[PDB]
Write a protein that binds this ligand. Structure first.
Ligand SMILES: CCc1c(C)nc(N)nc1N1CCOCC1
Length: 154
């Protein structure tokens, strides 16, 4: 069994929007916007809802760019993360209780202060290749196993 999650990256020609997670699991790291998909909403609707909750932004269109599965040792549920990106946003990003958003130039992405898996698949995102990933974590800092490939259909 896996649990559905979303991750949204606002990727513009020279910059990318990340949020500093202020509370909860992964507090203290920059990441895309996202979270659990709820009962009664599509995956893409959940992705839009999380983006709006965490940054106030809405979007005209989201594009599927990847799927990442996470195993955490000792946790029974796999995490099935559907990754989206967009270039056209609506609004100005604002800080929420959950996230403090900030734009980063694409050669200044703060990998040392992000989830360790981002170092592996973020390059493919920036290269606009679609990908499937798998990452097995011991705790929040240590990747024990991983796979990563480019795909044709996300
Ligand atoms: C904690 C799972 C996780 C890992 C390991 N890495 C990244 N980059 N994002 C993660 N999430 C994606 C969005 O849902 C919340 C958590």
């Amino acid at each position: 069994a896996s649990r559905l999650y979303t991750l949204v990256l606002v990727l513009q020609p020279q910059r990318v929007l990340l949020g500093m997670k202020k509370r909860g699991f992964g507090a203290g790291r920059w990441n895309g916007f996202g979270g659990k998909v709820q009962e009664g909403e599509t995956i893409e609707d959940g992705a839009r809802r999380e983006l709006q909750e965490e940054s106030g932004l809405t979007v005209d269109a989201l594009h599927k760019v990847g799927q990442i599965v996470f195993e955490f040792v000792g946790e029974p549920e796999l995490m099935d993360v559907h990754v989206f990106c967009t270039d056209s946003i609506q609004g100005t990003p604002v800080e929420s209780d959950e996230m403090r958003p900030c734009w980063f130039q694409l050669d200044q992405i703060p990998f040392k202060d992000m989830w360790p898996d981002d170092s592996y698949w973020f390059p493919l995102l920036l290269q606009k290749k679609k990908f499937h990933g798998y990452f097995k974590f011991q705790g929040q800092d240590t990747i024990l196993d991983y796979t990563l490939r480019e795909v044709d259909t996300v």
